[PDB]
Ligand binder design. Sequence first.
Ligand SMILES: O=C(O)CCC(=O)c1ccc(=O)[nH]c1
Ligand SMILES: O=C(O)CCC(=O)c1ccc(=O)[nH]c1
Lengths: 206, 200
Amino acid sequence: MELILNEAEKVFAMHGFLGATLKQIAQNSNVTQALITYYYGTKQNLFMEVYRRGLSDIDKKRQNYLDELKSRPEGYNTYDIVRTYLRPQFEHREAGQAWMHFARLQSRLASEPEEVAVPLRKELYDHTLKAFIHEIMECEGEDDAAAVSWGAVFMVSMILYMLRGVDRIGELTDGHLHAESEDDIVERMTIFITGGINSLKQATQD
Amino acid sequence: MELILNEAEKVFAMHGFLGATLKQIAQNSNVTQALITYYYGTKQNLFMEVYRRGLSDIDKKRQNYLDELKSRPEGYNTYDIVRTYLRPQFEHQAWMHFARLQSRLASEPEEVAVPLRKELYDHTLKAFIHEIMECEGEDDAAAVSWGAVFMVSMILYMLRGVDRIGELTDGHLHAESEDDIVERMTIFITGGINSLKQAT
Ligand SMILES: O=C(O)CCC(=O)c1ccc(=O)[nH]c1
Ligand SMILES: O=C(O)CCC(=O)c1ccc(=O)[nH]c1
């Protein structure tokens, strides 16, 4: 059910898709390559299963948080939607091994070959991103699709980068500023994205 | 040298630092490994030279655009500074390879990435933060500094050259041009910085 996947996850996170071998994953899992192949077919499908498992929980949480929003008596807005989308990528219990590996794996996604990345994002990222765009468009004052759609692209870029867990803010401020917590990071991303979407909207026409 | 660098650039862009071999780069360049070693020392130093060359021209152009800004009788603002920082990454083969190489930077080992960004990205980013702080209405360092981090995330992603907007809109929306991309990033970042400021 799970042990091979966990090991595969670790090896992919460390070496990427190309550098990972089924040899190594079989060794680390104490099984044969043939058994891994039996269950998962190709290295590419194993990689997809690792992403399927990780993103299934994340998207389930996004859906729960979005449902919560829709049950609020006093309504919700763009800020809330963005937060909802971001939270499940950054919240964990602070130990959080399972979290780390999949965070690191996603943070490397841009370096994976397009042959695996294209079908991956088509199956596992696109639908939920389109739904997020759609939800934002249903808000009051939101009737510029370009602004929201570009906003979504830039949001993704921020997610992948922050998933690295590098203290970039600290590096750039000589240690004077740091993220306080995962929630501070989510908060700052949310505000930044919400404002950016507004400015894209505002800049089209007057 | 110039030829070896170009080949090294291509191989690093395709395979990353770890997966790249001096063997392959020597083959593609029609020289021996020993000769590459002679000129560049280690694979790590070769990698750094590829980045030094690429970022030297980029930063030189940033500096020229910033000087232009400071000579304008009517002054300049945050929007102008951000644009100035972004444009040389997106205004152009030579272009493609370095763009792709930078877009993979997050997957490189920290042993090479740490000294790399220290030597080649940090100083100019701090200078960009500083220039924005010198503008009217800008006296929130956190907002600008977070803005700069998010700007970097956007740059690396857009340097992939993937039509993500097209993928997500069933082909209904696309980047018109490199300038349209720069424009949209600039507006987004400028507004985001404002919102961070406004929220504190
Ligand atoms: O843009 C990509 O290449 C795929 C990544 C993506 O669409 C994504 C990644 C994380 C996330 O939370 N939402 C979308
Ligand atoms: O954030 C990183 O890991 C290093 C990249 C970086 O600091 C950077 C990249 C492109 C650019 O234009 N300015 C900074």
